[PDB]
Design a protein around this ligand. Sequence first.
Ligand SMILES: CCCCCCCCO[C@@H]1[C@@H](O)[C@H](O)[C@@H](CO)O[C@H]1O
Ligand SMILES: [Zn+2]
Length: 807
Amino acid sequence: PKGRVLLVDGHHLAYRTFHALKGLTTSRGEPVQAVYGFAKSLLKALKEDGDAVIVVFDARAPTPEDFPRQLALIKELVDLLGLARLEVPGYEADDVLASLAKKAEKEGYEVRILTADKDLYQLLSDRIHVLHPEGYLITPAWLWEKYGLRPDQWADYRALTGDESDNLPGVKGIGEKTARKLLEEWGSLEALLKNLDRLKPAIREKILAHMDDLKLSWDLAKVRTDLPLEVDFAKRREPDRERLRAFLERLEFGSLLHEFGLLESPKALEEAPWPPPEGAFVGFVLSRKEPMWADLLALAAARGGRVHRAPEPYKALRDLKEARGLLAKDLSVLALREGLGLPPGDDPMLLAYLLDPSNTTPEGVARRYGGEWTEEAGERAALSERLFANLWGRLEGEERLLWLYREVERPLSAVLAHMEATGVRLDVAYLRALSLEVAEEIARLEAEVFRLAGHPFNLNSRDQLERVLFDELGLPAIGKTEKTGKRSTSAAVLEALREAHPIVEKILQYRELTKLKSTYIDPLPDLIHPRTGRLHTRFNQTATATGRLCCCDPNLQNIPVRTPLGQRIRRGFIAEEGWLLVALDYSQIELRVLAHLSGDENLIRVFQEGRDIHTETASWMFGVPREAVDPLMRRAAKTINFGVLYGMSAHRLSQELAIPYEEAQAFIERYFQSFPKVRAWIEKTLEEGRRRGYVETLFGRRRYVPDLEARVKSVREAAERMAFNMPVQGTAADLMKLAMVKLFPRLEEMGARMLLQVHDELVLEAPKERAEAVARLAKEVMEGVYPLAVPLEVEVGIGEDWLSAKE
Ligand SMILES: CCCCCCCCO[C@@H]1[C@@H](O)[C@H](O)[C@@H](CO)O[C@H]1O
Ligand SMILES: [Zn+2]
């Protein structure tokens, strides 16, 4: 067989489905039952496929007023899918179909015709078959077994009957046989179609008893196999994925586009029954990325390359000991919601992320190491297996990375799944009231932007902005980043100008406050899950540059710390009815980590003594006893203690404080005079960084910094910041993650739970008559997570809302 050809009866399929799913239309009117029906059934056959696919149409007089509208969309759909369309002017779909089937058959093709209209059953033969829109595989055997006939005599058997429209009103019966129960029993000695005179009533009587009624029933044979046409059998074209999407979304059926990805699938490997062996990698497909709000569309497993596919995903989740594969965490969150305890196991992403924190997405990890992140549960599983193979083999030779995976990454996965699957209760009543409050704050600011500038224009609509600034002129350049386009303008434009004009400042206040409101106060009440009644923030274990947890929906991280609004927003997050929120926070961990990593005895000493690092630093910088340190002094000490963390720079500090460049340089000198090892540390961090090509955290977390050795000052000053900005933050991240991993086991027994983790804070939720005890357990665990040169202090709080516990 030179191939398989799937001939589609676009014409009769389009007609059939127009008189099916009669309800379907896009919510705005626009009917869609014909397009849908056609698309759905097309896919079914295309699932079983053929090398070459040709959709035949009629190439009007009394058809439905809406039919052609939909038929035109059907063809648009055929095109956009890269399938061959064929209509020969003057020929009826069926004739072309029959003829295409014959041609392809003769040319050494196995031909499968997707149609419902029974006429084509006469062409049934080996090579040529029929796929019913409904299902089955109408074959010649199917004819003998379910009808008792053979193709050669099936358009005949159909001529003494009448389907629908195949006009023949009158059969009688005879021994109850009607014409149908008989059908085959007239095939012995023709009569109607060749010789046979005297015979029984109906059987014969009715045959001749209907002249003219037969010189129309010949329409069954309206399947001439000799239509003169060329069109050759080529394999599928490329689909217009940009417009298939635009198309489907216009009919509101973009919702099920994923199905169409399942035809351009890289050759099916070998399979096996459902329950995959213990140790197989799972692949899965969800209706939406957010696991809590998603529907598990498909679940598959891979072992040794043999893909196993679940017949029903949900019941199937019960056959797994754990979720082992890409985005394993996301499946455990779904299973959790589904009341199933399926903990996250190995995941290639965790391995990739350790080997290199630039590996942040499955799409990219997959592409980078010889694979592809598809949308088929089965391919994502096999991919999940080869990636683990390829990647475990490398990480294996690295003890520091292996330790991290085994003691931090892998178990953090399981802790992440419970936090995401648990959610936080929100005070929706407060969210709405708060929104009322914040709405007006924005109003007054817009009003003031009209009160001044005169013409009450509308902010944000960037066309105006330029204009209001021509009615009161003042406009130069910005800097070097983001240049000239309408985006590079809205990016850095105006900021430079906020300085001396209230109008260009109130504009910031508005423009920004709306974002904070739209990002943190409005989406929130809507993110309250129906089944849980809680918001389920999402936690990405990989994602960041420092190794810090990334969260989204909402990004708690970017919620403004220590401001009238950020504080107001945290009040939104509340404790369950009879529970209390326990927020624990690591006081100055980056500094306690810098002291450890630098080894600076004076830094180590302050933390050991239990002293205020900003006052002490001020003492040794401005030569006055701690008791005599004044507000300004502790202010310069606090910022330098803050700036040293990422170097900052003399000018930066010179600017962060109202001080001549000169004085800021002296301040830095004094800082390193009191902290020599801190300077030495930075110096060496960049050396090993430059030599080795990467830096690390206390625990071994690597980040490649090639740009330390650049040409452009502006550029080697970037890599240099990040260069030591990672060991410090990286170490602080690692201590938190590890803390979470130790603490988790004990909150279960304490009946408490872990909710959020932002910056260097961990928010727990515990039963009222438990909160105090849980708080003390967590402080212990957190403080003694890992032995460093100085103590670790955890400021803790308890309360009904996140803002009560405060930090
Ligand atoms: C121990 C208490 C010290 C009291 C404050 C000391 C301030 C000294 O500050 C000076 C800088 O201004 C000088 O340029 C540098 C580098 O050569 O030496 C520093 O010690
Ligand atoms: Zn047909």
